[PDB]
């Protein structure tokens, strides 16, 4: 039940170079999309902007769980401080989750119902959509914040912060409190919003198919190339986020079958990993979203069709 | 007549169109026939293609997953003018035969036939902030040069020439649409029995839709409200059918029925676009270019031929809806649609938004019978978009001439109009005595719409004004016409005066349906033009009057739909501003 002996070393290095990343990366973001607003007056960018703002903030509290991973597990830091900075994390994630899933569907409903996205009033409706995210995400994340306290000195001095469960779940409620809010997290944080999104996805991979498929030699290069753009979106969202939620659904899962002496050593081994690697979204966010968005490209940097005339036509 | 020209960006493609507006019969459609001019010196061993392409963007932009475009080509269709196929065998039109004697030898006709079931040119409405392009089903005319059908057509030797699609109204009218709708409720006693009926099936635009409701209320629930609402049905068909539903004119009744009562009542409804431009994805009809154009007119098809005809398809119909204290509605179908036109409809703004027009000789005098020509300098191109009125003694002018060369129906023969370049003459043949009279010249292309000074020829359905009055050296008066017989929604009321001893000057004119209001520079913000269709009467406010202003102010109005003239007037009211 012990931790990898060589965990403690790197969880701290990884999470800063998880640090340069994300700042470098989602402030960029951030900053680009201030300076350049009215330029594109693009409906969708507010997602961009909320998604970059959530990632920041996802990134920010990171180095006092970099510390706190420092010191077996100790954290110098204040007991609000602890509340704070775990309600943040979860808020973050699961407002990146919902951000990524509605750019997904803001694309379904510009590219697979087209007739419909001029009907609709995009710039409000983005609005409304991004509030209900967001106070929904804070919702959501009340639970992780109330929760959350710090000590388990255990006699040996070391304060820690943790999500204390004792505070509502009695002796026997522990298990039951513990596997629902796992429950409710995990789902609300990846199914709902990763159903949503593969199906947006799918449909723009058949309209776009379908769409490309006239032509020949550049329509079927540029078909296949959004095919990878839509590929390379699906698979960094997986493979970004699911080792987090599989090792969760893995622990409820061992909590009944009780995983004997080695997978569940397994298990708290690699979670800071698996922290590590669902920080791989937060950190190349900017590449897949803003570098793919020419205007970002340029604020980091005999064709005249004369006009129809007239003549006199003598009988 | 007159004939467009688009020339290419190089100089040498020149296609020439005789119209930019195809009727669609429904069984067989107008062919696009044209020429385009050809300069052998460039086409070494060349070719020139002309393509009719019959698009539909979509979706708003592009490149939204960068590389991601809209734009589906429902019909194109490709001929290849130069050298001609022999394999042709087409018979020239009047005009190609025409334009082909016009131009040299290097002239080469093209003549493309439009099949009968397609979506005709509309566009949804862009929304206050868009930009970019409209969602649409366009028509496009592309003329280039290359030396094969696949070759990558360049921008610098073709041409594209935007043309529209249109239906107009059949000449015979319709059935009366009437439908009934009998609802019953827990007392089952007698149901309600809602009786809608509107007066005609054809309805042309900006005109009322009157819509006789009778009820007779059964049973006991009452009705609070009279709901009765115009709405746009707008089918787009592009790979997932669906049907869009804008209201566009609405009357919200509170006649009420009582309980075992009956009740009848002609509601009357006008679909304008003044109070319509805010509703995003609205029908209207083909643009050219980014200019304002009607409501979309009604798309006629045949009876069991909707074979999910790519497009869009703009049909109306009436909701009357009873709010008994459960909905009870009636819908009726009614198609809106311009009238066949004798000239072709004007794709911008007629009075489009100062040429002065310099007219001779100002005095001339001969005997009766002979022939009398009088001409008119324009500063700046009005594009054959002058008309002539005549204006007797202590009367209102008459619209004599419409288009430089249209004869006004009830005008005698002996006038004609004629134009030769930007020099627009009148001739009068057999100078009767009935001729006495000063004639004046409008150009009707650009507002200010401007009048000439007026050529005193010597010969050695109503609209009523009233609020003159020799008052007020800086007060305010209210210049009411009241008109009869014409609805302020399919015309444009004109506000032009006429001080003692001088010539026509345009000082207000509002059009209802698109909802704008000019005024002239001298009247810019001291006039306030304003017509309410409670009575059909226009009003002009009148504020800061100056004594420049002393003038027989006249009532004018305008054919909102294709601009014609100032056909009907009032008899005139003195505002004598003086001391
Ligand atoms: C490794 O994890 C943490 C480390 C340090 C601080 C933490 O918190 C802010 C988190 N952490 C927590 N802690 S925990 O809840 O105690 C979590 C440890 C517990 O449940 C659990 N043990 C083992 C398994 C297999 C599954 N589950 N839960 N999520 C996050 C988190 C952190 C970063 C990013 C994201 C998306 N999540
Ligand atoms: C073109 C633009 C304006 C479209 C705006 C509406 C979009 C963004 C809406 C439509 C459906 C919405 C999603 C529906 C369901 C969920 C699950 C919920 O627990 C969190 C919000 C989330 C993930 C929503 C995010 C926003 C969303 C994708």
């Known amino acids: 039940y012990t931790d990898w002996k060589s965990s403690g070393a790197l969880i701290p290095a990884i999470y800063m170079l998880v640090f340069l990343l994300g700042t470098t990366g989602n402030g960029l973001v951030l900053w680009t999309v201030f300076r350049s607003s009215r330029e594109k007056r693009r409906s969708a960018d507010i997602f961009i902007a909320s998604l970059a703002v959530a990632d920041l903030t996802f990134v920010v509290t990171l180095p006092l769980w970099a510390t706190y991973t420092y010191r077996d597990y100790d954290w110098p830091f204040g007991t609000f401080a602890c509340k704070l900075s775990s309600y943040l994390i979860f808020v973050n994630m699961y407002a990146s989750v919902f951000c990524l899933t509605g750019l997904s569907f803001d694309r379904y409903l510009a590219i697979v119902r087209p007739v419909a996205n001029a009907r609709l009033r995009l710039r409000v409706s983005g609005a409304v959509a991004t509030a209900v995210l967001w106070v929904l995400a804070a919702l959501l994340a009340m639970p992780v914040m109330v929760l959350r306290t710090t000590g388990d000195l255990e006699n040996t001095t070391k304060v820690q912060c943790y999500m204390d469960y004792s505070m509502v779940a009695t002796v026997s409620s522990e298990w039951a409190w513990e596997v629902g809010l796992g429950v409710s997290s995990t789902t609300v944080g990846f199914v709902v919003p990763f159903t949503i999104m593969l199906t947006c996805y799918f449909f723009i991979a058949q309209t776009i198919a379908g769409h490309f498929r006239k032509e020949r030699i550049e329509g079927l290069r540029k078909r296949r190339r959004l095919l990878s753009i839509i590929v390379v979106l699906v698979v960094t969202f997986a493979l970004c986020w699911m080792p987090y939620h599989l090792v969760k659904t893995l622990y409820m899962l061992g909590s009944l079958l009780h995983w004997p002496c080695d997978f569940d050593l397994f298990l708290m081994n690699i979670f800071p990993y698996c922290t590590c690697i669902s920080y791989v979204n937060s950190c190349l966010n900017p590449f897949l979203y803003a570098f793919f968005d020419p205007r970002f490209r340029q604020a980091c940097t005999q064709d005249e069709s004369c006009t129809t005339a007239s003549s006199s036509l003598a009988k | 007549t007159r004939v467009f020209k688009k020339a290419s960006p190089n100089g040498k493609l020149t296609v020439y169109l005789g119209k930019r507006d195809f009727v669609d019969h429904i069984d067989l459609v107008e062919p696009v026939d044209g020429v385009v001019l050809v300069d052998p010196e460039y086409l070494k061993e060349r070719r020139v293609y002309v393509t009719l392409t019959a698009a539909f963007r979509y979706g708003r932009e592009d490149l939204d997953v960068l590389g991601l475009t809209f734009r589906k080509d429902l019909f194109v269709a490709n001929v290849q003018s130069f050298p001609p196929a022999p394999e042709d065998k087409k018979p020239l039109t009047r005009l190609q035969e025409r334009l082909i004697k016009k131009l040299g030898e290097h002239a080469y006709p093209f003549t493309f036939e439009i099949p009968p079931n397609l979506p005709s040119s509309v566009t949804l409405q862009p929304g206050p902030e868009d930009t970019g392009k409209a969602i649409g089903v366009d028509y496009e005319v592309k003329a280039f040069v290359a030396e094969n059908l696949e070759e990558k057509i360049h921008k610098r030797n073709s041409v594209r020439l935007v043309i529209e699609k249109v239906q107009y109204a059949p000449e015979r009218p319709g059935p009366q649409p009437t439908a009934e709708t009998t609802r019953q409720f827990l007392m089952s006693d007698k149901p309600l029995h809602l009786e809608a009926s509107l007066d005609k099936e054809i309805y042309y635009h900006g005109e009322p839709i009157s819509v006789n409701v009778h009820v007779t209320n059964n049973t006991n629930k009452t009705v609070k409200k009279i709901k009765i609402s115009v709405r746009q049905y707008a089918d787009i068909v592009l790979f997932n059918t669906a049907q869009y539903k804008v209201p566009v004119a609405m009357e919200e009744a509170d006649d009420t029925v009582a309980p075992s009562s009956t009740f009848s009542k002609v509601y009357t409804l006008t679909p304008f676009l003044a109070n319509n431009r805010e509703k995003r994805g609205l029908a209207l009809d083909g643009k050219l270019k980014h200019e304002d154009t009607n409501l979309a007119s009604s798309t006629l098809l045949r009876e069991g031929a909707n074979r999910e005809i790519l497009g869009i398809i703009v049909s109306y119909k009436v909701k009357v809806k009873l709010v008994v204290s459960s909905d009870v509605a009636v819908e009726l179908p009614f198609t809106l649609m311009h009238p066949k036109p004798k000239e072709e409809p004007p794709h911008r703004e007629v009075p489009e938004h100062d040429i002065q027009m310099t007219q001779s000789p100002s005095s001339l005098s001969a005997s009766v019978g002979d022939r009398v020509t009088i001409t008119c300098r324009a500063s700046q191109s009005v594009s054959s978009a002058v008309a002539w009125y005549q204006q007797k003694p202590g009367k209102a002018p008459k619209l004599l001439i419409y288009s430089a060369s249209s004869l006004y129906s009830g005008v005698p023969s002996r006038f004609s109009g004629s134009r030769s370049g930007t020099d627009f003459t009148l001739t009068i043949s057999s100078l009767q005595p009935e001729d006495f009279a000063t004639y004046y010249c409008?150009?009707?292309?650009?507002?200010?719409?401007?009048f000439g000074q007026g050529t005193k020829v010597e010969i050695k359905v109503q609209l009523v004004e009233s609020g003159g009055g020799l008052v007020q050296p800086g007060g305010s008066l209210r210049l009411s016409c009241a008109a009869s017989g014409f609805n302020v929604y399919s015309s444009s009321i004109h506000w032009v005066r006429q001080a003692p001893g001088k010539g026509l000057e345009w000082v207000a004119s509002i059009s209802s349906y698109y909802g704008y209001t000019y005024y002239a520079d001298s009247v810019k913000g001291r006039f306030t033009i304003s017509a309410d269709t409670s009575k059909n009467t226009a009003y002009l406010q009148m504020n800061s009057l100056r004594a420049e202003d002393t003038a027989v102010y006249y009532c004018?109005?305008?054919?909102?739909?294709?601009?014609?003239?100032?056909?009907?007037w009032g008899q005139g009211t003195l505002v004598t501003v003086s001391s």
């Open positions: 004018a109005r305008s054919r909102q739909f294709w601009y014609s003239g100032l056909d009907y």
């Open positions: 409008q150009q009707y292309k650009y507002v200010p719409v401007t």
